[PDB]
Design a protein around this ligand. Sequence first.
Ligand SMILES: [Zn+2]
Ligand SMILES: [Zn+2]
Lengths: 257, 92
Amino acid sequence: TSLTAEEERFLDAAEYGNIPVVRKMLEESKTLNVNCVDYMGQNALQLAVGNEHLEVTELLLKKENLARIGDALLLAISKGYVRIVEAILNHPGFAASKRLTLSPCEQELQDDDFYAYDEDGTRFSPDITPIILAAHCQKYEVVHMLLMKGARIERPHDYFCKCGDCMEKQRHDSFSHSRSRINAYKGLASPAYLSLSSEDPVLTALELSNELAKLANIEKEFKNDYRKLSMQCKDFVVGVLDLCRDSEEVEAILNGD
Amino acid sequence: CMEKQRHDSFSHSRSRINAYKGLASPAYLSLSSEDPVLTALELSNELAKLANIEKEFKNDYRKLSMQCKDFVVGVLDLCRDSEEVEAILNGD
Ligand SMILES: [Zn+2]
Ligand SMILES: [Zn+2]
């Protein structure tokens, strides 16, 4: 292990959540850069977030230069740790930047290891955003939090779009482009994002069901994926209809305003 | 093999099945050698041929062949770039 002894002493306590040892270690030590690594290639912050420890994650976030913050956010969103998500969103790195909204694949030059995982690639697909991942996992609290910050799933372009961006993404890694479209639609078709996304979500779900059925007929390779998403939308609509227990609510769902 | 066949031929066949159930395991398949998808494909074919040959433990060998096929398909499923799909679909 290339790591030295002091940073190992730091990381063991950070992983196992011993608040005072980590606090004493990172307070005024000349060495012990917080961006150090571990046996599995992980980080102090990622080991702290992997096993829910709001205190350790907060005291690590106090440090100005901390690496792999976006990976920690995606790991917290993957789980139900809403407090850790709030803490990481309160970080000044997210506040004054566009990093939260746009995907890790196309956010910036990406020289910084903002969303990086161990060494080679991101934890999840490079197309998945924090909000798309929250919709995938169906975390209602996290979806609402990310929607408050203005992070919304961008509806993918039409299949036959010929804009310069879609053509450029089609030239290289057309498979990855199709996979990213499917991820965006699986995020949009999530009951969490459907309910918390917009006013009148039953009409949104019906229209998205129709759109996904048409794209299932068009693609014909990922037909089963799009049909599953269309069934998700149909089930959401039927579930919203089922909860009605007055005639006024039934009338409101059966015909709009 | 002849000596092991003379006494306890049943135990010999059982030991062969145990060795193949160890080889066809996703753990040993992944951690055993470089390029494990080709290893799993070849082992799937070998286990299918031995299922046709034995005919007493046909179901055991068919289960192991299905294990190998499932491992190959699972490794293929995880691809999320076109380069990885191309690498799995054709070797080096
Ligand atoms: Zn376009
Ligand atoms: Zn022999």
